[PDB]
Short mmCIF file of C-alpha atoms in Angstrom, two decimals:
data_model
loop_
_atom_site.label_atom_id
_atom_site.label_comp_id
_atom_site.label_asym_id
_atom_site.label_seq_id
_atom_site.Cartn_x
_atom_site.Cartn_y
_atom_site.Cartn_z
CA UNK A 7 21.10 -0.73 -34.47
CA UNK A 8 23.27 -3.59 -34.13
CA UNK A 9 27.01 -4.89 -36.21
CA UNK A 10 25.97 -6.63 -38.76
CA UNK A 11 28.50 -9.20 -41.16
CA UNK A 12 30.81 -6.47 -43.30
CA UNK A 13 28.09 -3.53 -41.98
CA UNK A 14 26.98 -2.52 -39.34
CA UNK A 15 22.95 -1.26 -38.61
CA UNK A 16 22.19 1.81 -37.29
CA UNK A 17 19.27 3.24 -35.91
CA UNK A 18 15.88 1.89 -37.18
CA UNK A 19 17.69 -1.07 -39.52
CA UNK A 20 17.53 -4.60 -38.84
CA UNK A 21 20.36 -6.80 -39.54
CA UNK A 22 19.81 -9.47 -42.39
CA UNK A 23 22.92 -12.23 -42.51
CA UNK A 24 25.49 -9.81 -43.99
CA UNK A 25 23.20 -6.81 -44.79
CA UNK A 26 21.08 -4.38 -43.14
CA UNK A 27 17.38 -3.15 -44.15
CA UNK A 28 14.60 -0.88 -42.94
CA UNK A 29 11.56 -3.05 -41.24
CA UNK A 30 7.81 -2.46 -42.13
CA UNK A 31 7.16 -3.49 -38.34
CA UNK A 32 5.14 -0.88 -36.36
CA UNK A 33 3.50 -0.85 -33.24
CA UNK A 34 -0.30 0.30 -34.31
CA UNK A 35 -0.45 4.06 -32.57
CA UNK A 36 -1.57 7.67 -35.05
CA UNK A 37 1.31 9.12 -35.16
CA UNK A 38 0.08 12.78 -36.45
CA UNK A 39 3.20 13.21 -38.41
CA UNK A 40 3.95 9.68 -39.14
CA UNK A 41 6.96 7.24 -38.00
CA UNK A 42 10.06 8.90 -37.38
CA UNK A 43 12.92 8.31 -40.17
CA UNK A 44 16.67 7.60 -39.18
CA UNK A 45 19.31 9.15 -41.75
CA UNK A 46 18.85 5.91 -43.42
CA UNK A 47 15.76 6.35 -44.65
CA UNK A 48 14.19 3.55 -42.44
CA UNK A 49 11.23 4.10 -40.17
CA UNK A 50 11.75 3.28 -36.59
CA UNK A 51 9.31 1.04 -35.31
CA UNK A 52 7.81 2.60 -32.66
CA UNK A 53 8.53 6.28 -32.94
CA UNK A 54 6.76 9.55 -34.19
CA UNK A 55 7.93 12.00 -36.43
CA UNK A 56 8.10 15.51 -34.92
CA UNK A 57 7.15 17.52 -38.10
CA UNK A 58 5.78 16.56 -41.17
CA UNK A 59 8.61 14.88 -43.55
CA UNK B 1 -9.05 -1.91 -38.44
CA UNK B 2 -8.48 -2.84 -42.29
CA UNK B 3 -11.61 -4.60 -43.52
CA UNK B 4 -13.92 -4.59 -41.34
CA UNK B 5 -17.33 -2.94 -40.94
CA UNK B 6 -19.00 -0.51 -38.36
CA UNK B 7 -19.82 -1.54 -35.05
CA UNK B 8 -22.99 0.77 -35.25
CA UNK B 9 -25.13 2.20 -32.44
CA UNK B 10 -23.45 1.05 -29.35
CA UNK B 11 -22.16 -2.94 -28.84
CA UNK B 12 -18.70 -2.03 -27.77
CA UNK B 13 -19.70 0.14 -24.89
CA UNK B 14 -16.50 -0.82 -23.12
CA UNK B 15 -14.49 1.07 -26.09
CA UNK B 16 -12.81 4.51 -25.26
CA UNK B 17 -10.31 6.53 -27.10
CA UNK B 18 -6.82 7.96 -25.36
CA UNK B 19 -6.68 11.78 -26.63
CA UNK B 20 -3.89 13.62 -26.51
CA UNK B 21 -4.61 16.58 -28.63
CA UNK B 22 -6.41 14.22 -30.80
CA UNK B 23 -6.91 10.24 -31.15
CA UNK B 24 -3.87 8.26 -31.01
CA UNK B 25 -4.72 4.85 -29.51
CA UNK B 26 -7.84 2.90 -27.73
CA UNK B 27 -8.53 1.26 -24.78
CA UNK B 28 -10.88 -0.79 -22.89
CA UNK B 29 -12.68 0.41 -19.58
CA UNK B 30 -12.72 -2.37 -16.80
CA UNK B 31 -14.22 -0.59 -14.49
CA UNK B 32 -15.93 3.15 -13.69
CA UNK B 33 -12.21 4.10 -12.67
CA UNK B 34 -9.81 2.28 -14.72
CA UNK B 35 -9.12 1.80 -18.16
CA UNK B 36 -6.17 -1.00 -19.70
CA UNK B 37 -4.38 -0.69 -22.76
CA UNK B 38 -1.37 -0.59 -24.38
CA UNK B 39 1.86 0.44 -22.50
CA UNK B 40 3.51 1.94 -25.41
CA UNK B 41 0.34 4.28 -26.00
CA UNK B 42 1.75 5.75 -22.49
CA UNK B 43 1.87 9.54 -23.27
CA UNK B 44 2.16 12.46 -20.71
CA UNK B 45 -1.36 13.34 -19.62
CA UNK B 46 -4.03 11.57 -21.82
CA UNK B 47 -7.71 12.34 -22.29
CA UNK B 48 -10.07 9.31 -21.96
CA UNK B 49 -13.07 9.74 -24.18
CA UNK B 50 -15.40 6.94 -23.44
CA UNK B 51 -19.07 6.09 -25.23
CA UNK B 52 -17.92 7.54 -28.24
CA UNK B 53 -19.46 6.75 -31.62
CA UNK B 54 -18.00 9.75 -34.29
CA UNK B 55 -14.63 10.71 -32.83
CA UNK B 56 -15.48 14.14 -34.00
CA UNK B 57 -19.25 14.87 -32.99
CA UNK B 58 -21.36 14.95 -30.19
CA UNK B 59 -22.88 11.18 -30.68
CA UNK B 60 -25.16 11.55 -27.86
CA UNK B 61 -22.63 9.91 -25.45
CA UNK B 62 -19.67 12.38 -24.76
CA UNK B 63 -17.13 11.91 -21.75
CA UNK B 64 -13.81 13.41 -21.68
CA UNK B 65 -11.56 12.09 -18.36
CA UNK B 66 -8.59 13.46 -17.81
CA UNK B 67 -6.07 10.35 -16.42
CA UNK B 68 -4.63 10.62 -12.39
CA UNK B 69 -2.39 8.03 -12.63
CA UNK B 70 -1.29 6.32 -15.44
CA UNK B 71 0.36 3.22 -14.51
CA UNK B 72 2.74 1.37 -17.13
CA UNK B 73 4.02 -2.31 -16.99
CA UNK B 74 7.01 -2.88 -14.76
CA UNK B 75 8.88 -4.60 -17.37
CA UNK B 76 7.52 -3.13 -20.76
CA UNK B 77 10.49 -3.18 -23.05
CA UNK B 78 9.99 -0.66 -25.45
CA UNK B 79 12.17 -2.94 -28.17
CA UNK B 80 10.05 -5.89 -28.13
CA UNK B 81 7.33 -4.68 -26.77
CA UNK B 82 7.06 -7.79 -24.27
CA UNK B 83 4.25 -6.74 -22.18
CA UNK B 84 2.65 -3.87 -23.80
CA UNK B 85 -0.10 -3.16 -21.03
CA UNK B 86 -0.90 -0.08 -18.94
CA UNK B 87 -3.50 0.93 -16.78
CA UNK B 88 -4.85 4.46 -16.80
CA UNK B 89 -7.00 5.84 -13.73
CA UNK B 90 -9.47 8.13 -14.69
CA UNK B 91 -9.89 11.82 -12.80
CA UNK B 92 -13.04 10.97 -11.95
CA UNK B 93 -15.08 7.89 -12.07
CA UNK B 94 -16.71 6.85 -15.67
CA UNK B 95 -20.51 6.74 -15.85
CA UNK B 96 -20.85 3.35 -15.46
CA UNK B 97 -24.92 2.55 -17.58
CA UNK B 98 -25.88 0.76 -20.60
CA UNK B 99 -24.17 3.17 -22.68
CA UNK B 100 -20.65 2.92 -21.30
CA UNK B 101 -20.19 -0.36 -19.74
CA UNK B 102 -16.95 -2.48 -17.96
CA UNK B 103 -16.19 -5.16 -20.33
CA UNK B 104 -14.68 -8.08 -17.83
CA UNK B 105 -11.40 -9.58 -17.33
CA UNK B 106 -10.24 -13.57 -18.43
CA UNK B 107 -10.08 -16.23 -15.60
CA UNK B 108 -8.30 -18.19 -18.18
CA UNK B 109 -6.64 -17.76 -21.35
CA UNK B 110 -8.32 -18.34 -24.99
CA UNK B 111 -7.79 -21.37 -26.87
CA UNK B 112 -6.53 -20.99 -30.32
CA UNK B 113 -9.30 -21.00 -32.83
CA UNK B 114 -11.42 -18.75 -30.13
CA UNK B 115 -13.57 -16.09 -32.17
CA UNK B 116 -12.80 -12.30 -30.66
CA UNK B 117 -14.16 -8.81 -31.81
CA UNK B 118 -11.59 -6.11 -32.59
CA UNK B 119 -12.42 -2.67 -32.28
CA UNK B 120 -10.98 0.89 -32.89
CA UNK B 121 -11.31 4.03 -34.94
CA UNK B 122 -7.86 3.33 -36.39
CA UNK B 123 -7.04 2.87 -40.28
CA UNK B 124 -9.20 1.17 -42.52
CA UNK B 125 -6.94 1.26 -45.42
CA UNK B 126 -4.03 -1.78 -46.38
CA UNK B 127 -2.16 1.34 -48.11
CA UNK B 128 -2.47 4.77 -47.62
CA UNK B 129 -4.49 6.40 -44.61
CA UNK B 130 -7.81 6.64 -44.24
CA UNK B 131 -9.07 6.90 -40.94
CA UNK B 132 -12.73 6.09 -40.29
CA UNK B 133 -14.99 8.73 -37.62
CA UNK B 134 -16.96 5.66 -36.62
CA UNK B 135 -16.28 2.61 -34.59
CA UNK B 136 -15.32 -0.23 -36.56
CA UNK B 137 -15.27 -3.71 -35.51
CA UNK B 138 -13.89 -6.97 -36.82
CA UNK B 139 -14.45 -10.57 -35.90
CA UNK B 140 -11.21 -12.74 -35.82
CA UNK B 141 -10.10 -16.52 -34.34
CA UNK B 142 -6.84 -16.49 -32.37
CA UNK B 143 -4.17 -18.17 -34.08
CA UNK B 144 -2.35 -20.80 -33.30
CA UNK B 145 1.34 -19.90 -30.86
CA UNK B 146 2.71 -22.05 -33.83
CA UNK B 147 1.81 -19.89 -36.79
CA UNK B 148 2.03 -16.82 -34.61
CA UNK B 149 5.59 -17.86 -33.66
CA UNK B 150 6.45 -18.66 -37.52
CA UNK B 151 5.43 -15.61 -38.88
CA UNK B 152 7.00 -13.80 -36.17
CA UNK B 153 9.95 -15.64 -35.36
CA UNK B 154 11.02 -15.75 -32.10
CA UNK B 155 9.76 -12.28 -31.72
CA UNK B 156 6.26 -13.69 -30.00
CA UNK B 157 6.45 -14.13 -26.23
CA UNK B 158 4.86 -15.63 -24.39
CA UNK B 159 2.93 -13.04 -23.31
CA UNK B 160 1.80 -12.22 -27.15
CA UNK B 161 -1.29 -14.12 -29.30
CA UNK B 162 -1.88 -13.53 -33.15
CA UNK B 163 -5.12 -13.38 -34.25
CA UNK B 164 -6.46 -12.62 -37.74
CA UNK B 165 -6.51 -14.23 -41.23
CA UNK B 166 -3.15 -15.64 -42.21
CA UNK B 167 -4.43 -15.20 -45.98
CA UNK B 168 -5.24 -11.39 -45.36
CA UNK B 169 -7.25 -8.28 -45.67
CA UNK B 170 -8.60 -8.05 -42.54
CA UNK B 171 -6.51 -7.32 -39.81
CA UNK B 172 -6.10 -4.02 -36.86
CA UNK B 173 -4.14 -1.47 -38.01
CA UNK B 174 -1.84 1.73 -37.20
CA UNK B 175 -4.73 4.09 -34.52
CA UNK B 176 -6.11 0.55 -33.40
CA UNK B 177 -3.21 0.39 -30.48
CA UNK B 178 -4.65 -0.61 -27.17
CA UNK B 179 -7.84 -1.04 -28.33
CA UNK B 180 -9.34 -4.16 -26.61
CA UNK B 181 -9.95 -7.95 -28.06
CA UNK B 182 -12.95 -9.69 -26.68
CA UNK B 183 -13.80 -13.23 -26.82
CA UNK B 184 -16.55 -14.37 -24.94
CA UNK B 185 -17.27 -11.31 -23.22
CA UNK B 186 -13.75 -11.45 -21.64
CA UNK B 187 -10.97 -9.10 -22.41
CA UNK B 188 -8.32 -11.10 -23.99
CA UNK B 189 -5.79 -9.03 -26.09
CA UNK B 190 -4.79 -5.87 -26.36
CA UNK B 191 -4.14 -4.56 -30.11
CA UNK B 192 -0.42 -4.30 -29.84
CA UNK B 193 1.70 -4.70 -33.21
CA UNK B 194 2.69 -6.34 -36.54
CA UNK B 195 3.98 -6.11 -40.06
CA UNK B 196 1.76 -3.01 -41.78
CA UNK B 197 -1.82 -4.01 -42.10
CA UNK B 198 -3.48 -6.88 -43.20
CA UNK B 199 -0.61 -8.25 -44.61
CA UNK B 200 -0.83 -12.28 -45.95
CA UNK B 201 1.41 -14.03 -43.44
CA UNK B 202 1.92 -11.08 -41.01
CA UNK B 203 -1.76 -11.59 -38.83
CA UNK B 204 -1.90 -8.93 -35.90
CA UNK B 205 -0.22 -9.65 -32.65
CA UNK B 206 -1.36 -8.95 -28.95
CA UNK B 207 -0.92 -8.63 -25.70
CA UNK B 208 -2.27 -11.76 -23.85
CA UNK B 209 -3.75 -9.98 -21.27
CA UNK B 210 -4.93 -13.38 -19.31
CA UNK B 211 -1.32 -13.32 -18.01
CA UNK B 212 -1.30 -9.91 -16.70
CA UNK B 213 -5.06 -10.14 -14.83
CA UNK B 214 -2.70 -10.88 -11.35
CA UNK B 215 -0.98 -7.50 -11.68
CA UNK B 216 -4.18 -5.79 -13.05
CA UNK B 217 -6.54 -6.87 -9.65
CA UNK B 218 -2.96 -5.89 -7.13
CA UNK B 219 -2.83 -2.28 -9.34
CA UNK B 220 -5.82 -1.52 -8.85
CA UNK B 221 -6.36 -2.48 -4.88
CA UNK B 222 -3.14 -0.79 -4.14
CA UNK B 223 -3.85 2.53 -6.33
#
């Protein structure tokens, strides 16, 4: 989450310049249901899914 | 741990696995009552399951601990994950033997190019999931801050190491988290994060537990 150029990032995007995207960076836990996904479609980094996707 | 092979009969007897309904992170036992690892494997009451060898049968060696106190970093930040280290105080005090063993802590920190095992029961696959029942283990140098720091950049404190194989394919992965990082017989890192597994330019980063062994002796005297 942060403003980003003509954008602004929310929840698990990272700002790039004038754009933001969705990291691959994870912290290495099992999450059972995997990492939890903002509306975005972006994983946060450190963050389990409640239910199955 | 993504390419690496099994451990095998018992050589990592200072390995233990945090349950919590079922595996979700490692750590390393440093003594019959205490166990390190990870700060963001923190979880409301974990099970410690130490001398384990299948994390699904009986292997001969089977010792669930439930965790008293389990005390997280002072100054963790959950964002960048600047010291990622917790210490967990088992119920009841671990069978200390030649099956489940203390592995010790650093007097001083690794130089880079130091050889360290990696061990966990965490992914084996690069892509896709595929977690292994048996121990796996995986020999890797420490990097140096510089590449660390350019593959990550700025994003490696200085309480963070990489270690690994810039080129790839062997590297800890996502169930490997607070698993411990041994060179010499010392506990040196704690498998913390990185980019996905094994990646070329994205080695593993950890916790440089050498700076933490202070707070580690004072938690433990005082708790």
């Amino acid at each position: 989450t942060t403003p980003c150029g003509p954008v602004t990032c929310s929840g698990a995007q990272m700002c790039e310049v004038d754009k933001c995207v969705c990291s691959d960076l994870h912290c290495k836990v099992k999450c059972e249901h995997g990492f939890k996904k903002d509306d975005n479609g972006c994983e946060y980094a450190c963050i389990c899914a409640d239910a199955p996707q | 741990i993504v390419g690496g092979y099994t451990c095998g009969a018992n050589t990592v007897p200072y390995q233990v696995s945090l349950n919590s309904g079922y595996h979700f992170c490692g750590g390393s036992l440093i003594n019959s009552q205490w166990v390190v690892s990870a700060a963001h494997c923190y979880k409301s009451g974990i099970q410690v399951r130490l001398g384990e060898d299948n994390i699904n049968v009986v292997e001969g060696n089977e010792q669930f601990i439930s965790a008293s106190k389990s005390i997280v970093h002072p100054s963790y930040n959950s964002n960048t994950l600047n010291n990622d280290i917790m210490l967990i105080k088992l119920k009841s005090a671990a069978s200390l033997n030649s099956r489940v063993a203390s592995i010790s802590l650093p007097t001083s920190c690794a130089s880079a190019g130091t050889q360290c095992l990696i061990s966990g029961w965490g992914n084996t696959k690069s892509s896709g999931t595929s977690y292994p029942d048996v121990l796996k283990c995986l020999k890797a140098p420490i990097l140096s801050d510089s590449s660390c720091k350019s593959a990550y950049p700025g994003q490696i404190t200085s309480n963070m190491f990489c270690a690994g194989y810039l080129e790839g394919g062997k590297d800890s992965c996502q169930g490997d988290s607070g698993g411990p990082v041994v060179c010499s017989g010392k506990l040196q890192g704690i498998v913390s994060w990185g980019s996905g597994c094994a990646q070329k330019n994205k080695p593993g980063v950890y916790t440089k537990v050498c700076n933490y062994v202070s707070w580690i002796k004072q938690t433990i005297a005082s708790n």
